[PDB]
Amino acid sequence: MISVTDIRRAFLDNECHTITKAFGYLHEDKAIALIKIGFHPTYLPKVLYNNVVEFVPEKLYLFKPRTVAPLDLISTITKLKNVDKFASHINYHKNSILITGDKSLIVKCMPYMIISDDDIRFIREQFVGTNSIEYILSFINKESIYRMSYQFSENEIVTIINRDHFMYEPIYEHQVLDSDFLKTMLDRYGIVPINSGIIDELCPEAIIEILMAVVRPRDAIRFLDIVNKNQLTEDSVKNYIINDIRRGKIDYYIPYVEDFLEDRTEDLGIYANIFFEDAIDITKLDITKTELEHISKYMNYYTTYIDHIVNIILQNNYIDILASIIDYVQDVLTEELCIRIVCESTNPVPVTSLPIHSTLVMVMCIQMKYVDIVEFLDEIDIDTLIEKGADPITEYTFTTRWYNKHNDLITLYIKKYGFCPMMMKRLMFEYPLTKEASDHLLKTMDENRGAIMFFPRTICTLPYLLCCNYKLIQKPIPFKEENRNIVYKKNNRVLCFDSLENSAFKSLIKIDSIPGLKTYNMKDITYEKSNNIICVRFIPQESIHNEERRIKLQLFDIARLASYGLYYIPSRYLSSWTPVVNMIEGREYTNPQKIECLVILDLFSEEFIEYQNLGNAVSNKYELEYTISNYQAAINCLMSTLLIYLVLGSIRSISRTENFVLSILNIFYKGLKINELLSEPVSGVCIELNKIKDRASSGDSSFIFLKKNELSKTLSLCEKVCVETILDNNQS
């Protein structure tokens, strides 16, 4: 459990109403320490302003913009790369920032400043004679344009659209543009010319093509309005719009239909009533499932016929359609139907939209992993929820008032997250707790110190172990004298490096010193130098012919290298998958959307990085918001490699998937020198894996596509292997 002694002392001895207020009564030294690591309220009292400016300036945004001094603000954001959090400060002090005349400063601040016609006059004054005017203005935001009278020149508009393509949207509805300029922007940037500057009469084909290309409904409306002022609308255009309405594209055309298609309501059929109140009696029409899907978003126009529609839905078992109109059928929903919806619908419905909150409905929502199970507490007590397997501590719950209505939910929040600084920060500071709720929270955490509240399941979960802030101990490399009968390639290989300090060079040499590797072996290493450059000549191990054996033996080597402090970032397979970050922040995580390879390459192709530099390499490779430790980066690399070797390895495997998962994960243990065998149930994992295996033959693509939440059991097994990796490391 996170310690709360000091902040609870502050909360009680000053009779605060919120933990935010109590934070301000901490000793300035403790407050500043907490502020540095991000454990702070959303704002700070003025007494701390000088300490923040001196000791942690990047956190000045925690003061009201009026409280911050323009010099302090400008000194801070000059140093920072990301100033998103200073947006309201930057806007409030825009005049101070303009007066500086600093090109780099102004350009960094433009996306957050609401720029006025006067401000534009100041920029053209301070920068006349330089390339900078069209450069500075190219960083303007859509908010400035909406409130602006100024009109961009064409050069400005190009510079702006080169910097951010979709800035054409505010520009195109801000000002009248030359019609040849609109054509040039279409031929060259593919921008659809939706602007009042359209002057030439367009052929029926041209109108149909522009409609087929627009995406936002407001652009279709605008286009048609402009065009109708230039020319009459053809029967060819009218026909396409009716057929587009039949394809579900409705919002695009509501003004148009109401003004020009009044005499085509029989062609519009069931859709006509969206445009003309009760225009067609739909009971006399043959209604298709597709037509009901399209009008589901438009049911407020079919309330005259709501019974007929509901009846078609129930008679044809259109449960997804029933779910999509659930707000209109509250009176019809029996417990039986409520259950059907929960089990059969593609996407969940809100528990508040189910009028029946029986235990039976609740266990179906638990089975379907509904995120809003807490809403059954109007009928069912928290103990029955927990006994029946509910987890009400979700993101959904945080958007409700339930934490103030029920101190048992705050206790459950602590049991799930009391060790997790980011999640406790969120409840302590970013949730509108009551005095009594705030008191219960700090009391419960203070009287349950240590690990007792997380025993015996949570203390052995990966997120819990990531927040103990352990270390992975590296083992020293044993003496090597290679006696094995290794088959080497009949050709040598040369790798060159800019210097001998090169970390990749240093790890290649270290890996050569490591005994007992199965795939990463090298013969007859010679050196050649040219000033700083160092080249390594060597004869690589011949590749293992059996692909399944090769993949198993590569994971052994990965485990053995990790035990000695050498890791690799699997970014060629999972370019953005950092589940460790989710875990230490208390956020749920799921599988990546794809594996960017089909073939597991040999380990010679990867760059192995020292543990001591791993936190920095991982955070840079994945462009993380903040730098994670070497420990947490090591866990991410293992989690990534395990997922890749299980999924990709399965695909290329010829043995029974149950024996593959069990033997390659035991192979991983052996590389770690863990003497106990892995013995986990893999039946549920193998069903997930075999599904993906079957798409990989049918797909025929350059990547392996993974469906959302398809690998939950495989991920819990990757987690369990990492947990055992950490616990065994901590015994040594």
Numbering used by the authors: 1 to 732
Question: Could you give the paper's own sentences about this structure?
Answer:
Efficient release of enveloped virions, which promote systemic spread of infection within hosts, requires the VACV protein E2 but the molecular basis of E2 function remains unclear and E2 lacks sequence homology to any well-characterised family of proteins. We solved the crystal structure of VACV E2 to 2.3 Å resolution, revealing that it comprises two domains with novel folds: an N-terminal annular (ring) domain and a C-terminal globular (head) domain. E2 also associates with KLC, binding to the unstructured C-terminal tail present on a subset of KLC isoforms. E2 and F12 function as a complex and both are essential for IEV egress.
The structure of VACV E2 comprises two folded domains: an N-terminal annular (ring) domain spanning residues 1–454 and C-terminal compact globular (head) domain spanning residues 455–732. The final five amino acids of E2 (FKSSK) and all residues of the cloning tag were not visible in electron density and are presumed disordered. E2 is primarily α-helical, with only three short β-sheets being evident at the apex of the head domain. The N-terminal ring domain of VACV E2 is particularly striking, forming a central aperture that is 2.3 nm (23 Å) wide at its narrowest point. The central aperture is too narrow to accommodate actin filaments (~6 nm diameter) or microtubules (~25 nm diameter), suggesting that the ring domain does not encircle cytoskeletal elements to promote VACV EV transport during infection. The head domain does share weak homology to protein and glycan kinase domains, and to the bacterial SidJ pseudokinase domain that possesses glutamylase activity. However, the overall structural correspondence is low, with less than half of the domain structurally aligned, and key kinase catalytic motifs such as the glycine-rich loop and catalytic lysine and aspartic acid residues are not conserved. While VACV E2 is an acidic protein (theoretical isoelectric point 5.43) the head domain possesses a large basic patch on its surface. Given the functional role of E2 in associating with IEVs comprised of EVs surrounded by trans-Golgi/early endosomal derived membranes, which are defined in part by their specific complement of phosphoinositides, it is tempting to speculate that the basic patch on the surface of the E2 head domain acts as a membrane recognition motif. Other noteworthy features of E2 include N-terminal acetylation of the initiator methionine, which was verified by mass spectrometry, and the presence of a disulphide bond between Cys residues 496 and 535 in the head domain despite having included reducing agent (1 mM DTT) in the SEC purification buffer.
